[PDB]
Symmetry: D2
């Protein structure tokens, strides 16, 4: 009809859909290694390492040159620096990924900014120049992108407010359509933070409301779900709760929230770990995939939950490199097995 979205290029759509399914491949998930300069500082400060360019290059090479990582990792999200970086030995980071058949991805948002006259609710910035950036990143080897939006739960303050949800959904939908116009699969990340002492049922209600708004906006903006991925938070108690919900509970409410809101043309839901321990992140995903088969792949896009022990094993010490790659492999295998519901553990409500 007149007034509807123009037809997407079949050739572009096929590439997006093929790459989205490759990223959401059974038994595999995403390594989120896209910490910005300031975020990697936090990661590095926790093990007392100077956040220099050489240390960042050493560490990202340690990750991406891990032999056999591609058995469990389908894609790696990079920060812009890393996409154009060489390892200490001189090899481009993207070439390390290609050697393992890992698809490079690129974080494209420009971080967070307070929405005026909210109680420090956040807009995600980055649409300006995004289309041109996506073209350059595709040329450099990226085939998917990531944009992080953030929402808070605070019942006393009415958070997340209508304005927060509307802004998050609008930014994610604009970003996703721009990515697809430039042949990048968009990872849509509406992260609801665990901050607070709310119950898991409150997280479930908020997650549903947010995802319903996000997917309506994706439709409004002509986003191709077949060529997109979702990166949501699992549904959990708030982080100030003294009792973490059981893995069975987390899996139940997470799957329920997704099935109530996510159309099944979407190929993959790649969870963020959002402060969970490495073992919880694996056990929670495993429990969801014992409830399968599902209408979309339920898998992982983990940063902290894939790297925490790796970092602690490396300690900034070059000599600890092999040990560090071994622990990364241990966690990659755990989460690949969890994708299949076959992880053995390591060291209806309406």
């Amino acid at each position: 009809m007149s007034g509807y979205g123009l037809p997407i290029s079949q050739e572009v759509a096929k590439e997006l859909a093929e790459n989205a399914r490759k990223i959401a491949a059974p038994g595999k998930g995403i390594l989120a290694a896209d910490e910005s300069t300031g975020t990697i500082k936090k990661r590095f400060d926790s093990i007392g390492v100077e956040n220099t360019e050489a240390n960042r290059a050493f560490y990202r090479d340690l990750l991406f040159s891990t032999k056999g990582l591609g058995q469990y990792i389908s894609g790696a999200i990079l920060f812009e620096e890393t996409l154009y970086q060489k390892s200490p030995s001189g090899v481009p980071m993207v070439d390390l990924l290609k050697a393992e058949g890992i698809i490079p991805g690129i974080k494209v948002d420009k971080g967070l900014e307070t929405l005026p006259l909210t109680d420090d609710e956040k807009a995600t910035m980055g649409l300006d120049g995004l289309s041109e950036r996506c073209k350059k990143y595709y040329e450099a080897g990226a085939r998917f992108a990531k944009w992080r939006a953030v929402l808070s739960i605070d019942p006393a303050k009415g958070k997340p407010t209508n304005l927060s949800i509307t802004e998050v959904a609008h930014g994610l939908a604009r970003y996703a359509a721009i990515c697809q116009a430039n042949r990048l699969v968009p990872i849509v990340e509406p992260e609801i933070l665990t901050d607070g002492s709310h119950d898991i049922t409150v997280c479930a209600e908020v997650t549903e409301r947010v995802l319903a708004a996000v997917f309506k906006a994706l439709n409004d903006h002509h986003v191709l779900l077949e060529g997109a991925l979702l990166k949501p938070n699992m549904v959990t108690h708030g982080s100030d709760c003294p009792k973490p919900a059981s893995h069975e509970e987390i899996a139940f409410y997470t799957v329920r929230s997704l099935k109530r809101t996510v159309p099944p043309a979407l190929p993959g839901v790649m969870f963020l770990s959002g402060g969970q321990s490495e073992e919880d992140a694996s056990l929670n995903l495993n429990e969801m995939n014992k409830m399968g088969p599902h209408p979309f792949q339920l898998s992982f896009s983990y940063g902290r939950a894939l790297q925490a022990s790796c970092l602690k094993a490396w300690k900034g010490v070059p000599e600890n490199k092999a040990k560090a790659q071994q622990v990364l492999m241990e966690r990659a295998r755990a989460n690949g097995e969890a994708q299949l519901g076959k992880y053995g553990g390591g060291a209806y409500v309406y």
Copy 2:
């Protein structure tokens, strides 16, 4: 949180979800026998039968007393008259349904009314007194309800307009929540009419936009998808097209439109036949279920496509009753087999 829907009664939710799954049972579908007085007149005029109460009672008894119908029919939608009617032999219509294990359902809308200052776009009326009606109907044996909204495609006139879609979605969401509060599974019927000469791709675009709006509104109104059913139109060419789309095309675009918009917590999509021939209705459903397995049951809620030949065989003649029940069984079996993708025929684009 404060400001969200109160929790639905677990006992009510369980009943709704159990009955919705019973209606969307594999190998079965819905007989839509809820023609109002004026609509059954049309049906009867086409075979030259006087639209008297006795003829209506005779015909509905002919349908519901068909021995073995419950093998293929999970539920029967009734008009209010029929819900409180006895067969010519004195048996309540609901008792005929119960004897076959067919769940009674009830049409609860009060028909269509033009939206002011539209080009005869239609609102569905009936919310006033609906909650009280649902209570009475549950007492009388109904366990699901139906509400029909209607949209037109007309590119030159911009139909369906924003106001049409907004009204359809609002009425369906209010109706569905009221039904569930009264322990009735709501069938949500946003019918996009085939009127016009538009292509199947136009029907697909409009269907997507409408369903995205409907399901956002269902979420806004706290409707439990686990205890609801969808009754949409298949995606087809307009009825003024000289070439009907292939069964393969209709199945592809119909499944695609659903997977792009319908969250998989919904248990069943029960298609309306919307003027299609009996054989097309079966072949189109069969073709969709050759593409399975699907995240929800794809089945039928057919009026014309289950009764056309039955009516033509009955001819208002009492003596043609057995013959008429035989042809009804033939079509019920065809469509039950089509639900499984096993109907043998009778007498990716982004």
Copy 3:
């Protein structure tokens, strides 16, 4: 364009706009005498009068036969019973109104019903058959209509919820367009109740949000603002507050909330009195009209604030009739003078 509202009949629009301006006439306002059977019982119980048909007829005749009332009263809202009623002396109620040049109006909503899964938030019912009712009421002499929606403020519960506001706005917009299609000026009444201990600034915020939503919906539904009236609550402290806001404060925040949301094509804002005393209702309106001139008429549509002392003077005693009509005239004059900012009293913040 294709997809926009069809043009309203110029002849119908002119009648609506002329009658809306007659109702919002300088120095005059509306007598709200449309208490349903159950609401007039409350009014009558407060003075110990049996709520019989004869007593209702006696009292409404006492009101409408008050000589000279038309100097201050432009229109009178009636309950359906009264529109078709005769005075104890045999004169039709509408003929009493016509003799004073008071325009008859008619309440057309069917009362309130809880929205499912809200904390007893209310939908207004009555759209079914409304168009046909409006035709009959126009024939009987009504030239404007009234539909009351209700919202609550409760910060701890997040009231009014998004669903409440969406439903209120949708019902009011549908009702208003149906009225105008039938040559009745719609009074749009989104009453925010005073219940609770919130501050006047909270009432101001909520009133703004509600009115912004209402007027967006009126536009979506093709409502002619030139032929409509608004009946909102004044902006005040909650009724559990021990200190009532000053008349200066109430006037400031009320005018501010209106000027921030109401397009000036609307001819009149006719305030409800919402539990205020007779004197407060007059002084608050007077204070607003000392701040004039305004882009729309600020006037009154008072029930309790025009009748409280009248009822107390009548006491159900026929002999107290003249005294009762005198006190009604006293309050009508007070509020007519308040419309002009000339009431002498009786017995910027961003």
Copy 4:
């Protein structure tokens, strides 16, 4: 309540409201001199002048050093280059404005970009870094800002589409709130282009729909209308029409469209001239202000309609400077008089 906008700083709000009223001063309007490098090239190519920095500095100095211009010009919108530029004689451009008491303003958008999968419908870019830019611009002397969004009318293509309107409104509301957080009055410019052969009544319908959406979004984002200005298109026939509407018609439909959508807390509507001749722009504004008094100031924010003859008189020739300033004064006086409805000409439908 919890969940509403935090209170705006009273000190910031007072400054914004005072400056907005100063800009919308009776008998005055805005000189729009904010042509970007590429737009001023077009302007300069039409008179055959090389678009060098020195020529731009010469011309902007010619404009802003016009003696007595502040009698008719309350504010001047600048391009960023000009805000930080000195005249050929060495005087900062902002100091020329201050000497005449003209308030400096700054264009802050980053231009237009196609919305993916639309028929070259445009988003306005520029939110990234906007808050930080506004701080710098305030320091440099700017007290108001401008952001231009663009919509097209094309009935056959359904333009402006829902996505276009939603994007325009979202960008304008985000921009306006960010400006106000940084003490800049935002000019909200949703320009509906005249392109096409549509009638004035089509322009009126589209303008209403767009403005209703814009002002709902401004409310959603907590924008202070008391400290904002609107810069809309007048309501006219499309530019391909052989007959331009009468000045009486343009004034009627323009005022009507505003009064149907713009809340009267907004202090000023400062029209763009949008391709009209200098004389039409003045006569159309004059005709609107013969229909006064209005609930907001109706005035001008003219680029082409204040400069066309000035440019043609200058011809890039330095010696033509005084003549050019004289013609600028002639047009400034014409439009200041038109603001009052006192321009003498130069060389109800529902």
